[PDB]
């Protein structure tokens, strides 16, 4: 029932202006604009609002501490993140939060949630479905697939199918409203 969404920024939350500025949506605003209206009993925490290319190892320490202080309070946690370093973060958090009590699911999107053809809604709904599965650990949700976080790599730079599980089976895959684990 109870999910925490933690925002780190990234393309999913990006908003650019004709006058050249670049702004960012809080994680609650991302979900709203993505049209996710059935995420009830969800809390929101904005940890960062950065292009993930800026991420440094200090950010992993801060994220891990924040995760540690929430894993007992929620049944699942979702972290929205830019795709450029998403797999470094999911990998480091896997080593830092050794075997957590709940699913922690990193996700993002190749197209800002503000665009009408965005992959944000699919990725958020996949993450939300898995964060309720009772399957503990650190994962990445992307393009309808759930992948072990410490086995995930960004494989494409300009395609919706940006991430793959390398040398390890995909954990679950979306078919309709159902995550299938085999």
């Amino acid at each position: 029932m109870k999910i925490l969404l933690i925002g780190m920024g990234g393309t999913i939350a990006s908003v650019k202006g004709e006058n050249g500025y670049e702004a960012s949506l809080s994680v609650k605003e991302v979900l709203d604009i993505a049209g996710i209206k059935d995420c009830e009993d969800c809390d929101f925490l904005d940890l960062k609002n950065v292009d993930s290319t800026l991420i440094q190892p200090e950010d992993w320490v801060d994220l891990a501490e924040t995760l540690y202080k929430n894993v007992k309070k929620y049944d699942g946690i979702i972290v929205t993140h830019g795709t450029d370093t998403l797999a470094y973060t999911s990998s480091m958090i896997s080593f830092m939060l050794r075997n957590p009590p709940i699913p922690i699911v990193f996700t993002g999107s190749m197209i800002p949630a503000t665009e009408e053809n965005s992959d944000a809604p699919l990725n958020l709904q996949t993450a939300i479905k898995f964060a309720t599965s009772g399957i503990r650990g650190v994962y990445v949700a992307f393009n309808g697939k759930v992948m072990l976080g410490v086995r995930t790599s960004k494989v494409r730079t300009m395609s919706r199918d940006a991430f793959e599980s390398i040398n390890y089976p995909i954990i679950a895959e979306l078919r309709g409203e159902d995550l299938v684990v085999n």
Partner: protein, 128 residues
């Protein structure tokens, strides 16, 4: 977090930059090798440089290829790299390899200890 350097192996690559890295205070080095992994045993001073440095800092070997891991027992260049003290990354992703090494270095600086840990499946990253 400790500073690690990641260098892609290319034809003719020298041990130069590796000494410079150690001299700069880098605490670990990852080399993306070819195929199943290894170090050229002639044509450069790279292997001799690594024999020395692998004693001071962990030198880890992964692959530039995307799929299947390294296996340094497979070829002479791999077995010689092992003899030189190279730590294999097995079937880990590059992101797991880098972050795992960084995480380990937070806890220890003993290269032989780092080597046991890199080779141990800590959280599902590796087939050991």
């Amino acid at each position: 977090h400790m500073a690690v350097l990641v260098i892609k192996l290319i034809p003719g690559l020298s041990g130069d930059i590796f000494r410079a890295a150690v001299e700069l205070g880098y605490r670990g080095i990852v080399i993306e090798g070819y195929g199943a992994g290894g170090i050229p045993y002639r044509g450069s001073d790279l292997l001799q440089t690594i024999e020395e440095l692998s004693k001071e800092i962990p030198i880890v070997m992964t692959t530039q290829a995307m799929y299947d891991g390294v296996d340094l027992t497979r070829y002479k260049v791999g077995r010689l790299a092992l003899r030189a003290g190279v730590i294999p990354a097995g079937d880990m992703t590059k992101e797991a390899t880098v972050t795992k090494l960084m995480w380990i270095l937070g806890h220890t600086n003993n290269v032989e200890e780092i080597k046991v840990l890199m080779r141990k499946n800590l959280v599902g990253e590796l087939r050991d």
